[PDB]
Amino acid sequence: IFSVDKVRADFPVLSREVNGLPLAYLDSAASAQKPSQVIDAEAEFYRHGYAAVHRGIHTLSAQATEKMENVRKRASLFINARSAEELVFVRGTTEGINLVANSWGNSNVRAGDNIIISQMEHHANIVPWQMLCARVGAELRVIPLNPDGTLQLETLPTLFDEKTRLLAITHVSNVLGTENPLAEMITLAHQHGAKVLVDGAQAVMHHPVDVQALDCDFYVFSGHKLYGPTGIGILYVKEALLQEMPPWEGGGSMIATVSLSEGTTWTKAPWRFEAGTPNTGGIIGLGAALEYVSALGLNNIAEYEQNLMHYALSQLESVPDLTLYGPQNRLGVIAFNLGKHHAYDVGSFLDNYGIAVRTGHHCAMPLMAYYNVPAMCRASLAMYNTHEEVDRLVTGLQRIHRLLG
Amino acid sequence: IFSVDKVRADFPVLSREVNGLPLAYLDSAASAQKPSQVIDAEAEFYRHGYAAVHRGIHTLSAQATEKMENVRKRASLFINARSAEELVFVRGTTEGINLVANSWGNSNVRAGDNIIISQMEHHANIVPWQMLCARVGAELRVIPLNPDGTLQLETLPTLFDEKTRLLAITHVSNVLGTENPLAEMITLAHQHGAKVLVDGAQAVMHHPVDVQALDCDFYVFSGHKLYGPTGIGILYVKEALLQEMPPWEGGGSMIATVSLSEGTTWTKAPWRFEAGTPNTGGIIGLGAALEYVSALGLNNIAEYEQNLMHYALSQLESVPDLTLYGPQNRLGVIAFNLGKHHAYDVGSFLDNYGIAVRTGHHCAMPLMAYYNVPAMCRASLAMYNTHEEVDRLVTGLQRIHRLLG
Ligand SMILES: *Cc1c(COP(=O)(O)O)cnc(C)c1O
Ligand SMILES: *Cc1c(COP(=O)(O)O)cnc(C)c1O
Questions:
Q1: What is A37-296's CATH number, 3.40.50.300, 3.30.70.20, 3.50.50.60, 3.40.640.10?
Q2: What is the DSSP string of B73-112?
């Protein structure tokens, strides 16, 4: 059982004041605050054990290399991959998706083929596929939305066919909070021989994730949303697919031999996908974030967060003219619009009260278009957020509506 | 005028002990140690002002965005670019070169064209061009080396022709320490209409760099060698070329509009080349590293380093059977082999004495092949290194040779 006061004491930013008022940070879905255990693990590495990591012979380099490969193993256990060698360190979810789109996509998606995404996807899980489709002459097909923010799954029979090579789908929507029924969609996709890439950027901080039970071919997530540093993320790929993938970036460490007259040969997976000095400091920090979350327990986090969400949804019913977008069982985020006020103005007033929410299209323009709105406000209710911050959001929306209505 | 004792007091790792002995870190060319000003600037950002940066409406996000764009401006002044908008944040030199090779390369290098590199290049400035040449049917031409580690510039007339699209060349060799005559090579290249990419990963920490005086089209460097955090680097591109470059990675923030029926449009340079959440923590750290180096003064650093180098080369003359590779006016690094002992063994003994050097091919296999050796040892003599550490290296090589000879 969870203690929000003890969790909050680990996060130095939560004591901050903004505009002379106490900060209510409701924007973790854009990027999470980081516990002092994470900030200090990276700082301590730089202050005491820093070195280059390419299996250097000297002591510091050999120890830094082992720290990096231990984080690879820890991340692999966190998502229940079968092996540490199925995980590639990238800059974040976006880079992971681009790596798959070029390395797997360029060799497996041909002219006349199709790829399926959904209308709720974030731009990170849209744009790389649009680019691939334009390079190879393939078609980007779209699973449409229902008004409650769930996918229209009855349309799958018209979208999947013998030319469908890939399903790229979000685990959890960054706007709606919808959790998609991945295991069943993946079963469907595999019956056609299609691979499945899952965008898990908003899933990994809310409940346990198991890629062997999901049976996904590719899974991606970013460290900075998982209470860790920026500049680091994970791409998981089934071993059999990753072993056939050609390299994306070229340079040092991803090669086996380099010759200017006989050409270059590549090293084995995962190292073939990691060119140049890695973000070692970010990798040490991510390892600490995974330990921090695992010590609190994801089932404990999920229980507290669901209870906070239930409290917020119940309190938000007393805000006049509030429109909510997404299903009632939403995870993590609440997307809303207040009466006819533009989201930018509502978010500006909320910021003037010390409450940080995100406003705009949330990198999901197609999703905004589906709802016929230019933008939305979004409150994130993470594990370190409280009932009191929910009460300040409800009061603030009531005040805004009184003032501007 | 420089004070090495005061500079060393800012670097927490330099007090460390390794194998029960005092650390002599002579591997800065692989990755540099970081001053507490740099480590703390990043930690302080995470502890007090952390937020997502995509011009968010709330206060923390708006301030984080401004911190990031101020670092872009500071980096642009450090290399004397004309504008902050000519600089793109990447993971490091390697990613920068891959970005240019795909985005500029794919649209400007065609079947039957050629690209020129040199035989001293690091793999980061070789492999992306080999990959581009294989994608488009172009030829990779090579400027050969002279025994003293300098380029055979008399071969340029046979390598440059009407089909030469690009010269990709190192500013300063990571093994030899040779500084190439960039301004004159760039004049030559531009007479043929060829563009020039400069690999400045080993130049920016040793003396002032001026891209307007060099007139290079592309310039790249990494933060971790410049006393800053890992996971962050800079790609500089002349405005007129960058403005015509299409995007490489796709996703959030690099778009202007995203549509699933009308396609996607891109934002302007530099932001079109930066997809997804940036490495904000690394960018804050890099800004602090640039301030730290500029406050010591690069001409002061260069004077101390050149004097230390002159002392080392003079002391190394008393090591029996030492072979040195590179010119006498080398910068930063000393590449060597001891008698007939394999470099791995020499480096292992040096590590047993607490002295960290790099051994192996240094991501420059063609350079090792040129000298007909499998590997070399390399000592780096950076601004925080001392005469005493040089004396320990000389004694250690003398002891190793006595013991194994
Ligand atoms: C280290 C180095 C590179 C690669 O830098 P990364 O930071 O590993 O991407 C490229 N060129 C030279 C000359 C180098 O020394
Ligand atoms: C934030 C997010 C992304 C992009 O992550 P980056 O860390 O910015 O690369 C992709 N998908 C979803 C669902 C997200 O929430």
A1: 3.40.640.10
A2: HHHHHHTT-S-GGGEEEESSHHHHHHHHHHHHHHHH--TT
